[PDB]
């Protein structure tokens, strides 16, 4: 144990975004209801100068059937950021998950992935790319003046698949062209001022890192205007090692790319939740102290790499809301709690908060 | 002697604020008449991108009797800053000096500090906190869109007093609650965008440093939204040592606090003015050269700590106006002159100017 | 050979200005036609956040006869920068080249440099300084709200001339007073917010460096409001050595001066073009790899000196347009091609691009 400053309320504790003002933005993923929850709204105004929609801007949320755009939840998050002078990230224009099946049906209502006529396959490819372009055109035309950071594609690399290309219907139907078109359409509709990212997880693992590096070079060679890599950084206390994170950021920086940490959380367990504690009160202090040392190591690394990192965004606000609790229950027969942030479920600061707010 | 660049006019000499553009703001304390004095106004526009009122915004200046707000002098300083794109600091919402006695009278016209009925003392405490809240509400509502930096309380720690709490009437009547309320009211009226400081002098001395650190932690534990510490830095050529200054800034940074240097001057004498020179022309060059080396050491330290220091403000413009001349005369039987700045009384640069403007 | 990343199109390659966002602006010299050439305009929007007129704002371009101001070409460049949020530099208010002869004729139509009556010479000096003041007044009044960076005088030092002062008609008629007046008039018309530079080439050579340093100190002693030195940096692969560049920047920083690199190019040849290659396709890869290592060394030096350098501007966009091709032909009997940029004549990135865009 090394962090023994008091567990004060986070609502008025010194601002995390302030601490990192000349390093990178400090962001949080939010749901629309949190923009009007008193404590969550206060937490955002106190600690965060960047916001991303955890779920409200995924493809199925915004265009659940063709041409039927659903803007209300997304507008709510954008308006909260505008009211409070926060930057925004867009999650996400393209993803194999959270994508409605109408994209991948031919004009006949049948799955394009089953088509065997080569000329018809080329027509389906053209049609799917037009649908993708229209999804992007609508969303970027609406938000381009307010959202500067765009996860144009998400999780398109899978090292277990041939050539490293995740074999989603996107890839089955268009190869890598859906990725090329996604970036071109985003630039066409949004102009030079928006920053376009390829977002993925385990970006430091090999050979996934090579595959992402290879893909970006291939896209660059095709004239694709990519600006950066987003690193989800869903990490644990021990994995991955900090030196591998450092080499990954430097590596993509060598292609001229900006880097953002997009979905940061530090689980208390391994991958998978080998044994979750059942309740929050059951987590011993030693675990939070271990998590504090890990957060310290991460953020001091981010400071060293500050000229290659424009933003660090957490995948949530406080420990009362995190996607890791679904996984904790799942692998522990219905009961389990994770604690991945620097703010606890009662909106108090954790040892990890003091570890990243201090002078180093 | 080490600084032999010419003693050019400061009016058009290279800008001090420019030199520190990516480190911290460079500020000066001013009186309203100096916003319309040709040479002082030019000096501010040339060298400073932050302004503070030396006297015009103290409690007795702004609310000399209850509810009788006097805005003219303060408005003048704020308008000069706005015309010239300068940031502002507010000195100061609460101070045991420069505070009119009406605050501390019960509704009966008698000193609250003399009251012996416990229930009546609690009523006086409530009344004094309401008067404090109204003073802050009026001032912050008026200036919140123009002043980002607020000395919410000033000089509230005194190591000679029990528990380190300066035993002013504020503390005699309310304990530390006046400090809690001062910060809460300032945040309530001004929003999250204004930065709230506790300002004091000798912040590197022990045990004063501990007492300030202890008090801030206690206020943080009560939910108080403090953002930073202001260090007056009324220093001499030899005191305090630079390593103690460094440890102080780092120490408060460890609580997540920003730091500003708020009232910087480097006296030519010890504490007290053991022997002032009678006139400015009597000061030998060796003294200015010693003062230059001291200013060099201070500002190179500030550069090293730049990510913990947002602003460095001098307690005046040029050597023709400084509060240290009152003290120089006082302790030298009516005659005496100090020279605490980098600009001399004829608006020429001093060796100290060249020492902090150069490449290091 | 060390840089083997692909020679992708530069039009959508990761942004150079983005890479240097927290170091200095990245600029390019342009001609008006390039603001409407599809590829040049795209290159500026992709890679550059600062623009300078290669020729359209020289004295003869803007005021070819007395009082006959020609604004169209200059306005075009300023409007392109404004549309795209780019900063601007002004090249240049005073220069011995590109200056129409009407400046230097007495009211009698005869060359002021030939006048032998001392009282008449003082009248011509006064008249030439009034004409200079009016040229500057007109240009600064028109553009002061849009152009922050002003090359007030250009190439006024010549180490082969007595006292180091280039013996142009400006100096023959007014001594150094034309320089004093140029800076004062620019400040008078433009205010404190515009930054005023003395621009020259070979600024690291001795004794030219001493002469510039000496002149600036003399101007500072006369009350002249100079803010910075512009270093043209028309360099080769081997000259000048990087340590001499470093000492030059530090040296002028010691006078409190900002520094900008104003006309950067890295010729493939010596001075003069000892042997140009006849055509672009004749340049071997080894030369581009040598040029890449040189650009790497320069920009890593600029990063180290980032707090003394506000902007780095290239004297052109891509290798299809550069003034060095006139000199390559000249000294090679009509045929010759240089390649001084990081972007090639077909708007593809060069090894030098990868060398300055990477993580270091
Ligand atoms: Na730095
Ligand atoms: Na989720
Ligand atoms: Na005073
Ligand atoms: Na030219």
Numbering used by the authors:
A (entry chain A), B (entry chain A), C (entry chain A): 5 to 364
Copy text verbatim from the article accompanying this structure deposition.
GH10 enzymes hydrolyze the β-1,4 glycosidic bonds linking the xyloside units that comprise the backbone of the polysaccharide xylan, which is second only to cellulose in abundance in the plant cell wall; xylanases are, therefore, essential for biomass degradation. The design method is inspired by the evolution of new enzymes in nature through recombination, insertion, deletion, and mutation. It starts by computationally segmenting all structures belonging to a modular enzyme family along structurally conserved sites and assembling the resulting modular fragments to generate a huge combinatorial diversity of backbones. Instead of using the natural sequences of the fragments, as in natural evolution or laboratory genetic recombination, we next design the sequence of the entire protein (>300 amino acids) to maximize compatibility between the fragments and stabilize the active-site geometry.
We then selected the eight most active designs and two natural GH10 enzymes for quantitative kinetic analysis with the chromogenic substrate 4-nitrophenyl β-xylobioside (O-PNPX2). The active designs spanned five orders of magnitude in catalytic efficiency. For instance, the most active GH10 design xyl3.1 and the least active one xyl8.3 exhibited OPNPX2 hydrolysis efficiencies of 9417 and 0.61 M-1 s-1, respectively. To understand what were the underlying structural reasons for this vast difference in efficiency, we determined their crystallographic structures. In both structures, the two catalytic Glu residues were positioned as in the design conception (<0.5 Å all-atom root-mean-square deviation (rmsd)). By contrast, the low-activity design xyl8.3 showed conformational changes in the residues that form the active-site hydrogen-bond network (2 Å all-atom rmsd). Furthermore, missing electron density in β-α loops 7 and 8 suggested that at least parts of the active-site pocket were mobile, although design accuracy was high throughout the segments of the design model and experimental structure that could be aligned (0.9 Å backbone rmsd). We, therefore, concluded that accurate positioning of the two catalytic Glu residues was crucial to obtain any level of activity, and that high levels of activity depended on atomic precision and preorganization in a large network of polar residues that surround the catalytic residues.
